[PDB]
Design a binder for these strands. Structure first.
Ligand SMILES: Nc1ncnc2c1ncn2[C@@H]1O[C@H](COP(=O)(O)OP(=O)(O)OP(=O)(O)O)[C@@H](O)[C@H]1O
Lengths: 602, 331, 194
DNA sequence: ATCGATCGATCGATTTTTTTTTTTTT
DNA sequence: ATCGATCGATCGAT
């Protein structure tokens, strides 16, 4: 309706001057943010606009299609006032907006829900490659002359061009490559989430539409949310059905979100002010697993690989390994299995396949095509799902040796490869790798070296820079320090807010790049000499050349945590100490003697 | 409607704490305390909080074992046809998946079809099985897996998935000797690992032997089961009226923040200070998770008593429950 | 779990097989109801619903007391069996005298049982001696371990009590589950560490 | 003479399609 | 290749 044009003025009001939490319009910043970002897709809080007028959202609840198609229009110029010449750039944007329950799953939807925007949940599945879209139609026609001007079509119809542009026909309309705008297009399959799947019922398949920025941003097998519009669209022929006559349902979400956040200036800026404190390192342990208590030491190693680090590349050769391979020697009854789960919702990118039997998925790439049928599908190992994201696994003892080859495999080349079958490539996957496995038999396998402790080979274990060993035999006050802690934990029914701390690392992994100064680092080459031969004196060795390489990947972490951009001595201070007793605990009870020599390295 | 009046009529009765038990499973003869836990598996703890974060359990577990022809089968088949969505298996060949994903092939036109399967659908419900030793180790892994991560991730050469199973679980694996072997430490007595052992609190062993008084009682009580009559003999409660009462009990989220919870701590201290020596007794350790179930123990108790925040006397009950639960590991 | 087991056997009666062969000697050439029982097979189902009443219960008890002197699973059948006999003769109430041969039909399988895990110690004495042997070897040998071959030499050879290698290995496994022993690989056998 | 329906010549669209390399299970 | 519909005209009716 035309009066809705009047709505634009009012709906554009909330678009700009609205503020909350000490003013500071996010949309004003939204404009300036993208902005140099030039995301060219705005997002709006539904909760806030609904807080203002849900009646407008009710139209979004009614017919959000043109509602935003009206709503987007000034959003361009509403930014263009902020960006006077930007119109030359992209000349288009549309708001993804925000939470819009719904919160409907898959199989629950109805024609009542049709044509009105519906946010929806589902598991990402196989999809077509990104294709060009017709965007704006135009006709060089036949007898009638060029260019005739562009027609707006279509998603997706484009008709009918009966009689026009001169005359009419047979001089009829036909599209020409010139002066015709196009855009990216991707169809996608997304099935409902199995974790949310009702028992014994097969999950339903759903088509997933992609246009503009939304396209290709999704990745297959991802847990995801989507805000779409359900319709009988489109066609309907489908001359097959017929009985009973229907248009097969399809939906394009305005928005998509991975399982289930980003930093901003005003966020990061004060967020930078948090970084300046040195003691921040502690609250990192304090914010590590506050509900868990547990070992401050075990969490330290958690803090390490969790924080990530520079690869770093060597011209023009190997980048070595910037990801930590984390290992945990388990204890029965201990919180160990629980912690990595903390990291799970903690990690921006995370994947947990546990041991085997087997949790998702095959732990390796089994995919062979198969042209035919229909195209089949290609996948890698479990780590393929998350790259640069840390690995999550536990109790390799329950793993098959075949999949266990990929274990030592993944940590090694940091690229995935397999023999099946005709298709030939090189897959590169870089993932920090966590491991926690329960010791064979009892609480503590043997005082004898963990090589005696574990059936697992040291060489495959060798890829593990960090070994998390736990204990202990019962102690009096020990549980008072915990059980009292634990009981008070359950009373529910210091650390940084996880949003900040989780943003902290992702902000870090996205930005800060520490570098050592070779001068003061000479000591470690000297300090390590104490850390090999004397450490060699007991056990076999088990000192490794790779092991030294770790200390740097160790150092890189704390520095970014310090946000120093370069390696500092204090960064090493932990780096050594982290490694010292870590290597120490691997020793037998004779290590108590080994403890006294390591004192020089403190 | 008027049914809730029955509740208020039920909630007034003190002896119901005893009566709920006597009303439990009349088809079975005796075993008493074993019965209560069945109800206790039927109402778990908060299975929730406390943030940020991790969601603390929650649930509960038992595997009762002893001489075959103990009619331990009486319990499973009882509640399996009793409690809603109660799932049961032979506990030998599922085969594996069963609970695992096949993963299903072909389609056709595709492959890698992901079945749950098996124990998912019992989700937020009591699951019962038999003889873990029969399914060997292969699934003991994931069986133990579901016991940690609760909900489990799964696939084979397919798409990744994490399936939700939060399911109360019980089962029965016959003794390797089917007998005792009283001197047997329950730890090595069970033919299985401690973690799956320590995970379920608790198995609750029982044994059978000839008692001429009971042999007549068995001769008496059991044949009346065989009897077409008298079928007139009854427990205090209609199974249905208690089940609806169950849901009324289900509604509660009793939370003991009461300083008596502090008293529970040394009760755990006093629980395991003695178990340091020797280790050849019921240890275990005892596990610290035992205190966790000690939480879920009271979590089960208060629901039956309907009162929130429980009491230490109740705390003693669950504590004592573990004690006999643990002492079955003694000798 | 099976309701009953009939165990077929041949005594080579002379004196049996001949006349059996004489029964086999039939065809050759050239009171037995045929279908009339099959209707009674159907007739005896829905039209007969027997109840043992009091009398049968009393007898059923003492037998089973001597049965275990068995299982309630056998007691489960004793009722299920006799009442089948009760389904016979159009009875709506069981005869007190059926259950005799009802237990006896169980006795029939029982007479088959006159002819291992169920005999006292077996693996137990073995594991006591396996333990004591490796303990003595532990305190004597400079290791807490000894070879499985050396075990087959130090166990199986000495006596009939001593079991065959695989069965020692079974005892060792069951001891490994007890944490009385350590495998120390396939090459050797170790005693549990303190 | 206006209107129609009627037949025919006008126009243009529709006609094949599943087997050998595989792969997670004990 | 044949069948299918469009569409054109024409000869009768009012
Ligand atoms: N140090 C600790 N602090 C707080 N809670 C703990 C601690 N240790 C153990 N727990 C509790 O015990 C439970 C341990 O379960 P978890 O998820 O770690 O599986 P797991 O015990 O590692 O399995 P397994 O030991 O068989 O490998 C958790 O629920 C946790 O609350």
């Amino acid at each position: 309706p035309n009066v809705s044009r009047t709505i634009a003025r009012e709906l554009k009001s909330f678009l700009l001057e609205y503020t909350d939490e000490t003013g500071r319009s996010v949309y004003g910043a939204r404009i300036r943010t993208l902005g140099e970002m030039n995301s060219e897709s705005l997002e709006v809080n539904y909760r806030h606009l609904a807080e203002s007028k849900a009646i407008l959202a009710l139209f979004l609840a009614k017919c959000p299609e043109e509602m935003l198609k009206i709503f987007d229009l000034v959003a361009m110029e509403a930014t263009e006032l902020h960006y006077p010449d930007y119109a030359r750039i992209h000349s288009e944007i549309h708001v993804r907006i925000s939470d819009f329950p719904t919160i409907y799953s898959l199989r629950e939807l109805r024609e009542s829900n049709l044509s009105s925007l519906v946010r929806v949940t589902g598991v990402v599945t196989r999809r077509t490659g990104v294709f060009p879209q017709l965007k704006y139609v135009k006709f060089n026609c036949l007898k009638c002359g060029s260019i005739l001007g562009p027609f707006f079509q279509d998603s997706n119809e484009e008709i009918r061009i009966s009689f026009c542009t001169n005359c009419k026909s047979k001089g009829p309309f036909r599209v020409n490559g010139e002066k015709t705008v196009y855009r990216n297009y991707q169809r996608v399959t997304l099935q409902e989430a199995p974790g949310t799947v009702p028992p014994g019922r097969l999950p339903r398949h759903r088509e997933v539409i992609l246009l503009a920025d939304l396209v290709d941003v999704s990745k297959p097998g991802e847990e995801v949310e989507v805000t779409g519009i359900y319709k009988n669209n489109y066609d309907g022929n489908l001359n097959a059905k017929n009985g009973f006559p229907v248009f097969a349902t399809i939906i394009e979400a305005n928005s998509i979100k991975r399982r289930e956040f980003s930093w901003t200036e005003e966020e990061e800026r004060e967020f930078r002010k948090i970084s300046r404190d040195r003691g921040i390192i502690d609250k990192i342990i304090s914010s590590m697993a506050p509900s868990i208590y547990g070992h401050r030491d075990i969490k330290t190693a958690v803090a390490c690989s969790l924080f990530g680090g520079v690869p770093k590349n060597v011209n023009g050769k190997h980048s070595i390994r910037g990801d930590i391979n984390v290992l945990l020697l388990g204890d029965p009854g201990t919180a160990k299995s629980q912690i990595l789960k903390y990291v799970e919702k903690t990690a921006h990118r995370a994947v947990f396949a546990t041991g085997q039997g087997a949790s998702a998925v095959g732990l390796t790439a089994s995919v062979r095509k198969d042209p035919i049928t229909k195209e089949w599908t290609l996948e890698g190992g479990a780590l393929v799902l998350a790259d640069k994201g840390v690995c999550l696994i536990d109790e390799f003892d329950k793993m098959n040796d075949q999949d266990r080859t990929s274990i030592h495999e993944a940590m090694e080349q940091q690229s995935i490869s397999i023999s099946k079958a005709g298709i030939v490539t090189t897959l590169q996957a870089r993932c920090s790798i966590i491991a926690a496995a329960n010791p064979n038999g009892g609480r503590y396998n043997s005082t004898l070296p963990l090589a005696q402790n574990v059936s697992l080979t040291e060489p495959i274990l060798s890829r593990f820079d960090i070994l998390c060993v736990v204990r202990d035999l019962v102690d009096e006050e020990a549980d008072e320090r915990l059980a009292t802690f634990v009981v008070d934990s359950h009373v529910r029914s210091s650390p940084i807010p996880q949003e900040l701390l989780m943003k902290y690392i992702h902000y870090a992994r996205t930005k800060i790049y520490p570098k050592l100064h070779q001068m003061d680092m000479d000591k470690v080459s000297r300090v390590y000499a104490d850390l090999r031969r004397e450490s060699i004196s007991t056990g076999s060795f088990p000192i490794t050349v790779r092991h030294l390489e770790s200390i740097l990947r160790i150092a890189e972490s704390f520095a970014k945590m310090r946000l120093s951009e370069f390696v500092s001595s204090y960064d090493l201070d932990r780096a050594i100490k982290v490694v010292v007793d870590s290597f120490v605990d691997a020793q037998k009870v004779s290590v108590r003697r080994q403890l006294r020599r390591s004192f020089a390295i403190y | 409607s008027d049914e809730i009046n029955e509740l208020k009529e039920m909630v007034k009765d003190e002896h119901i704490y005893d009566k709920l038990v006597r009303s439990i499973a009349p088809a079975v003869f005796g075993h008493e305390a074993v019965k209560k836990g069945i109800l206790l598996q039927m109402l778990g703890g908060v299975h929730k909080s406390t943030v940020e974060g991790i969601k603390l359990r929650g649930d509960i577990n038992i595997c009762v074992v002893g001489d075959p022809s103990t009619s331990k089968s009486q319990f499973l088949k009882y509640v399996v046809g009793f409690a809603p969505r109660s799932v049961y298996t032979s506990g030998k060949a599922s085969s594996a998946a069963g609970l695992t994903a096949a993963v299903v092939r072909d389609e056709e036109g595709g492959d890698y079809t992901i079945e749950a399967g098996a124990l998912m659908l019992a989700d937020n419900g009591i699951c019962c099985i038999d003889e873990f030793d029969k399914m060997d180790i292969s699934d003991q892994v994931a069986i133990h897996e579901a016991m940690e991560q609760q909900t489990i991730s799964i696939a084979k050469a397919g798409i990744h998935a994490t399936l939700n199973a939060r399911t109360s679980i019980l089962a029965a694996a016959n003794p390797v000797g089917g007998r005792y072997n009283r001197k047997l430490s329950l730890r090595g007595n069970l033919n299985m690992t401690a973690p799956i052992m320590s995970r379920f609190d608790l198995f609750f062993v029982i044994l059978d032997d000839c008692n001429e008084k009971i042999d007549t009682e068995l001769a008496s009580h059991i044949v009346d089961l065989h009897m077409k009559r008298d079928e007139a003999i009854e427990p205090p409660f209609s199974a249905e009226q208690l089940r609806r009462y169950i849901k009324y009990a289900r509604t509660f989220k009793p939370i003991l923040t009461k300083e008596a919870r502090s008293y529970l701590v040394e009760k755990y201290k006093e629980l395991r200070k003695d178990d340091a020596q020797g280790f050849s007794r019921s240890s275990y350790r005892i596990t610290v998770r035992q205190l966790e179930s000690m939480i879920r123990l009271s979590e089960a108790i208060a629901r039956a008593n309907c009162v929130d925040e429980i009491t230490p006397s109740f705390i003693a009950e669950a504590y004592d429950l573990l004690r006999q639960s643990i002492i079955r590991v003694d000798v | 779990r099976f309701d009953l087991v009939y165990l077929v056997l041949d005594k080579v009666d002379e004196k049996n097989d001949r006349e059996l062969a004489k029964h086999l000697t039939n065809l050759y050439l050239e009171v037995l109801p045929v279908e009339f029982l099959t209707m009674y097979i159907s007739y005896a189902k829905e039209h007969i619903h027997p109840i043992i009443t009091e009398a049968a219960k009393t007898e059923l008890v003492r037998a089973y007391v001597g049965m275990r002197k068995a299982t309630t699973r056998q007691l489960e059948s004793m009722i299920r069996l006799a009442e089948a006999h009760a389904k016979m003769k159009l009875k709506n109430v069981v005869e007190l005298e059926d259950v005799q041969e009802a237990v006896r039909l169980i006795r029939s399988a029982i007479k088959d049982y006159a002819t291992q895990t169920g005999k006292s110690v077996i693996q137990r004495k073995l594991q006591e001696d396996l333990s004591r042997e490796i303990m003595n070897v532990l305190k004597d040998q400079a290791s807490d371990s000894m070879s499985f071959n050396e075990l087959i030499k130090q166990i199986n050879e000495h006596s009939q009590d001593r079991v065959e290698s695989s069965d020692i290995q079974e005892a060792l496994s069951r001891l490994q589950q007890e944490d009385k022993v350590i495998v120390l690989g396939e090459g050797v056998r170790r005693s549990v560490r303190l």
